[PDB]
Amino acid sequence: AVSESQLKKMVSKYKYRDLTVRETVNVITLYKDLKPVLDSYVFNDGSSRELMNLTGTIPVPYRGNTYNIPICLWLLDTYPYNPPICFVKPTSSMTIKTGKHVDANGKIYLPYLHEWKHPQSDLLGLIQVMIVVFGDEPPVFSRP
């Protein structure tokens, strides 16, 4: 994976670095296709900041098969006290299936994010929710 020393260096400007690093470790230890990456987040204001996101796939059972659903979770620099900004990340070969929990840009909406409160709310709990919702209604299509 990535080490915690590397994670601590990557999120060095975060307000709650040890908590963010611990939750990230737990996620990438469990979901080995999620990778931590530093990238520029384009805010609504127009400003931009360098934030860590978790990007990759999570395993989702759907009607007799397990699908690798591509996602992106952005951690704000006040993580874990504000929720991540979450997207499904379809490849060039994929479409986004919109619905109650997913808009046309791939942004995800869930009661868990709206209701987010630390420490009862965390990235592992969130991913469990995504696995249930996407298991009911896959947010990405790839064939007719």
Curated annotation (Swiss-Prot):
Tissue: Heart, brain, placenta, lung, liver, skeletal, kidney and pancreas.
Outcome recorded upon mutating V42A: Reduces interaction with ubiquitin; inhibits down-regulation of EGFR
Subcellular location as annotated: Cytoplasm; Early endosome membrane; Late endosome membrane; Cytoplasm, Cytoskeleton, Microtubule organizing center, Centrosome
Documented effect of changing V88A: No change in interaction with p6; no effect on HIV-1 budding
Signal sequence extent: none
N-acetylalanine modification, residue list: A1
UniProt PTM comment: Monoubiquitinated at multiple sites by LRSAM1 and by MGRN1. Ubiquitination inactivates it, possibly by regulating its shuttling between an active membrane-bound protein and an inactive soluble form. Ubiquitination by MGRN1 requires the presence of UBE2D1.
Effect of M94A: Reduces interaction with VPS37B and HIV-1 p6; abolishes interaction with PDCD6IP; impairs HIV-1 budding; inhibits down-regulation of EGFR. Abolishes MGRN1-binding. Loss of interaction with ARRDC1
Domain UEV: residue ranges: 1-144
Quaternary structure annotation from Swiss-Prot or TrEMBL: Component of the ESCRT-I complex (endosomal sorting complex required for transport I) which consists of TSG101, VPS28, a VPS37 protein (VPS37A to -D) and MVB12A or MVB12B in a 1:1:1:1 stoichiometry. Interacts with VPS37A, VPS37B and VPS37C. Interacts with DMAP1. Interacts with ubiquitin. Interacts with stathmin, GMCL and AATF. Component of an ESCRT-I complex (endosomal sorting complex required for transport I) which consists of TSG101, VPS28, VPS37A and UBAP1 in a 1:1:1:1 stoichiometry. Interacts with HGS; the interaction mediates the association with the ESCRT-0 complex.
Task performed by this protein: Component of the ESCRT-I complex, a regulator of vesicular trafficking process. Binds to ubiquitinated cargo proteins and is required for the sorting of endocytic ubiquitinated cargos into multivesicular bodies (MVBs). Mediates the association between the ESCRT-0 and ESCRT-I complex. Required for completion of cytokinesis; the function requires CEP55. May be involved in cell growth and differentiation. Acts as a negative growth regulator. Involved in the budding of many viruses through an interaction with viral proteins that contain a late-budding motif P-[ST]-A-P.
Family statement drawn from the similarity comment of this UniProt entry: Belongs to the ubiquitin-conjugating enzyme family. UEV subfamily.
Domain notes: The UEV domain is required for the interaction of the complex with ubiquitin. It also mediates the interaction with PTAP/PSAP motifs of HIV-1 P6 protein and human spumaretrovirus Gag protein.
Designated name of the protein: Tumor susceptibility gene 101 protein
